[PDB]
Each structure stands twice: as C-alpha cells, then as structure tokens.
C-alpha cells in the first residue's frame with residue numbers, strides 16, 4: 001500500500017464540484033474540512049467522486065440524509081467494511097461491518113458488559129483512576145495531555161473491559177492503533193502489512209490465553225464485570241473460543257471501538273474549552289451542566305468522521321441516484337456541523353439544548369454500543385477536573401492525526417492551574 005504524503009490542500013472555492021475529494025486524510029489536520037463539507041452540504045449533499053485513491057464513492061453530508069442512510073438497513077449494507085478503503089490482502093470479521101440478523105446475534109452476546117447495571121459497578125474504579133491520574137500531573141508547566149491523560153485513562157479502561165493483565169494494557173492500545181490506521185483503509189500512517197499480521201497473530205494468542213486462563217480460574221474465582229467473565233457465565237457464549245472468527249472478532253471490536261474514540265473525546269474537550277474559554281467559566285458556575293457538556297464535546301469533536309456503507313439497490317437521495325453496489329460514506333463530521341440542524345454549529349456551547357441529538361455515535365442498528373461507557377468516562381473526567389483546577393490552558397497549536405476516519409490529537413500541550 002502507498003503512503004499518503006502531505007501536501008497543501010487548496011481552498012475549496014478554487015475547485016470544481018466534481019474535483020472535491022473528501023477522502024484526503026489531511027483535511028482535518030489542515031483545518032480545511034469545515035469549508036469542504038460546507039460546500040458539499042450546500043451545493044452537492046449527495047456527491048459522487050468517481051476518482052480517488054480508495055476508488056469511487058458517494059459523500060452524504062447533511063444531517064437528515066445521514067440519519068436516513070444510517071437507519072435504512074433495508075437499503076444499505078455495512079458489509080464487508082465500514083472504513084472507506086480496504087484492509088490488507090487478507091487481515092478480522094466484526095459485527096460493526098455485518099448486517100442483521102447475524103449482526104444482532106453477535107451484538108446481543110456481548111452487550112451486557114455495557115449494560116447500565118454493569119457500568120454502575122465500574123464507576124468507582126473509573127473515578128479513582130481518573131483522580132489518581134489528575135493528581136499525578138505537573139502544574140504551571142506544559143505537558144502532553146495525550147499520553148499523560150487521554151491514552152493513560154483509556155488503556156486502563158480497555159484492560160478493565162477484558163480482564164486483560166493491567167501491566168500489559170499498552171498492547172491493547174498499540175494493536176488497536178495499527179488496525180484503525182492502515183493507509184489502505186483510512187489513509188492512516190500505518191503502511192506495514194507484516195506488522196499487522198504479527199499483531200493479529202499475537203492478539204489472537206493473547207486473547208486465547210486469557211480465555212483459557214479465566215476458565216481455569218472460574219476454580220472458585222468469582223466472576224468480575226468484564227466481558228470474558230460475562231461470556232463464560234451465559235450458556236450461549238460459554239463455548240465462544242470454539243468459534244474462532246466470532247471470538248477474536250467480538251473481543252477485537254470491543255477494544256478497537258473504545259480506544260481512540262474515548263481518547264480523542266478526552267483531548268477534544270480541552271481544545272473546545274480553549275477555543276471558547278467563556279464556557280469554562282460557565283461550567284464552573286453551573287457544574288450540573290457536565291452531562292449536557294459531555295454531549296456537546298462529543299458533537300463538536302465527532303471522534304469518528306464517518307461510517308461507510310454499500311447500496312443494496314439503487315436509491316434516490318438528494319436529487320441523485322446511488323447505484324446498486326456503490327460505496328456510500330455517511331459524514332458524521334459534516335452532519336454535526338449542519339446548520340440545518342444545529343444553529344451556530346461551530347460554536348462549542350455547553351448548554352446547547354439539542355447537543356444530545358448529535359450523530360457522533362451514529363443512529364440505527366449500529367448505533368455505538370459503548371456510547372454510555374464513553375459518556376460515563378467523560379463525565380467523570382470533567383467532575384474530577386472541576387474539583388482540582390481553576391484553569392486548563394492549551395499552550396501550543398495541537399497536532400492532529402493523519403486519517404480520513406479518526407479525528408484525533410497526537411500532541412496537546414496543556415498547562416494546569418490548581419484552585420486550592
């Protein structure tokens with residue numbers, strides 16, 4: 001797979017409609033994504049690009065149209081992939097890229113790990129880790145929030161969800177980064193197929209051991225609240241290792257789904273607060289805004305820019321005809337900035353009344369399974385921030401990640417001022 005090398009993105013008004021290529025993974029880093037999507041929403045809301053490095057595709061960029069595509073599982077398929085391109089020549093079936101009814105069967109089998117009753121049992125540990133992390137950070141001198149907080153809290157969460165050995169939690173993050181980030185799939189920075197195969201093999205050995213280990217301990221160990229515990233308590237799933245593709249798939253999806261999304265929500269809120277510092281004063285006055293703010297963070301950031309589908313038949317949309325078999329990209333990042341839905345869509349407004357109606361988790365049968373865990377982690381982060389810090393300043397332009405899919409930060413230099 002060829003690497004994507006950064007070059008300067010031209011002003012969108014300099015281009016013919018036919019030439020707008022929103023698969024470029026530097027649109028986010030260079031700040032051009034907003035104007036590019038505005039033009040599409042306004043002049044070509046259902047747009048066909050016949051020429052791209054990932055092959056041809058439709059872009060759907062308005063909020064209401066994206067809702068329709070996402071909810072229309074009768075017209076659009078999630079199979080075989082939901083990223084714009086393709087993973088390497090043969091690398092792990094996951095229910096995010098499956099249609100009902102098989103989709104439903106697989107998702108039902110793992111969804112209890114994020115049931116409300118279950119999340120209630122994790123809350124104390126999340127809060128204690130969050131507090132410990134924030135207590136460890138330097139004050140009045142800049143540090144990189146991305147490894148210090150966002151990645152650190154996330155890797156700990158991911159290990160808790162499996163019962164993954166805590167001292168090896170980094171491997172979950174690294175394995176997930178390499179998959180999420182294949183150049184061939186998302187225009188991401190990872191171009192070595194061999195390292196992916198090694199990760200795939202190593203992750204399958206690691207999961208297979210942890211399963212056999214936990215079976216051995218469950219003898220007389222009480223089950224915890226992790227996914228593997230729960231799967232080996234439900235009679236339908238207790239044999240899951242005897243179906244290798246479903247076993248590796250469901251576990252991998254859980255880890256990949258919550259890895260960069262939560263990390264980038266955790267980083268993105270500081271970026272939005274730094275761009276609209278009045279909001280942080282508003283928050284300090286009205287701390288009961290935290291739950292609505294979490295929604296507004298998630299909007300505003302939109303951690304995953306899109307999900308892709310294939311048209312099961314010809315479909316009329318936005319004054320066009322999507323043909324059977326065409327790839328179709330639902331641009332959440334565009335829909336969350338659609339002024340037809342959200343007034344002043346680029347402003348971060350903690351008390352925005354319809355923040356909860358964001359599409360960052362999508363809608364329909366694939367709507368994010370981990371949505372409540374993400375919201376719980378983020379509320380707790382901000383509760384714990386608000387107890388400790390009078391200000392939280394970003395001191396350098398953030399470095400943003402190369403990807404058409406992930407909307408994230410690799411460097412975020414922050415200076416904290418304690419309250420007393």
Ligand code: HEM
Nearest residue numbers: 095096257258261303307361362363366367368369370374
């Ligand atoms: C802010 C954080 C998150 C964002 C923005 C996010 C976003 C998404 C999106 C856009 C989808 C597919 C939606 C669609 O196709 O309509 C999805 C699915 C999924 N997410 Fe998340 N997610 C986040 C956090 C999490 C976490 C923490 C986990 C796991 C603990 C997770 C697990 C999943 C899974 C398993 C699915 C597949 C659901 C299915 O296909 O039925 N997500 N997520």
